[PDB]
Amino acid sequence: KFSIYPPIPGEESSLRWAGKKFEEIPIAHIKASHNNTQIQVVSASNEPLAFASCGTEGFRNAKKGTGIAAQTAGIAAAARAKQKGVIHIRVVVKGLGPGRLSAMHGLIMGGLEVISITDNTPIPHNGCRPRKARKL
Amino acid sequence: RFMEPYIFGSRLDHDIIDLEQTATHLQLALNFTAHMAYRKGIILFISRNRQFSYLIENMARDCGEYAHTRYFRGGMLTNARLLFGPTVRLPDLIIFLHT
Amino acid sequence: DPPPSTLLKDYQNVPGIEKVDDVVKRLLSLEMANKKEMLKIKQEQFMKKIVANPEDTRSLEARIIALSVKIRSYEEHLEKHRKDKAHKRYLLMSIDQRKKMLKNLRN
């Protein structure tokens, strides 16, 4: 038993967490860029609870794009959520850039419980053509 | 390629040798060997199958002849003069059980 | 140019078609079917007109007719599609082939 695949918005899945449906549970948007990760927390109706990033917490510069920084950011986000009453979170990932799992970890530490992880990293089906290949 | 005249055919991709042909060849080869033996000639059995090394050695022992079923060093025949003394009698015939 | 309401090269020999429904007739007409059927019809007509033995297509004459038809088709296509260069190329080569055939015939 237990499916990997999520419960659809169509009815009726016999699941709740804190007496709430899957769609009702808030989303924590993690934007893992290559040199900073920003972690928003939002309700099901799209009301923002708590923004927090590696810039907002202390760090500046390349030290934004470490895992530790990401973790810290996540923790901060969790803390902010806690005041407003959240507990369980869906997680949504954007991009790659070390602070991606780290953010999640931070969130967990902060006390929020991870319910699901979905990465909507924008993979353009050939859209804009990116920067020229630099000399490393 | 160079065993196609001696092959009969192939039964489900498994090749079968012409037994008549083998017999014909055998009659020659064995006869030759016998002749060599008669003429006080050194016969040398050779192999590298391992499975049959012991057997070959035994065979060599039983007859007046010899064997070399082990790793063939570089120049047991071409360099003989050095690997043994200067006055060696090389094999006057050789037999491979496994070429 | 053959009329649009004419039957196909396929559904011509068959018997009952002469006294059949109108919709059915329309369905089995050049007007509905694609340009290739029309081309075929044209070829047939040409054969009827000119060649001594229709139902051959191995003799030079028949081949020439076909070539001519193809050329015509190409020309029609190139009325529009004036940037289509492949078709132009096809036309040009095909005309030369036709010319060659004609020469051979003459010889």
Partner: protein
Amino acid sequence: NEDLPISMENPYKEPLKKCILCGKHVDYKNVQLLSQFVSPFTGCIYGRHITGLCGKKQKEITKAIKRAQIMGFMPVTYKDPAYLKDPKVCNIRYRE
């Protein structure tokens, strides 16, 4: 005379393997079948090694899928979650 062999049409040859989908007819209207050869998570079309199809068949499937995606019969960035409880044709790890 008699007992020599006779050249003969290759017996014990088991008839060649089938696509699974060989006699079948694939339409963009049929989402089910098409859905079956898409990854549930990404909505990406499975390869040939994964799907296990003849080349013609595979091509037919892929074109059909594409048609569905444009003509609005099928989803694109995922495989429809109503069609997960169906026969698994494809050979795939993830989950273990």
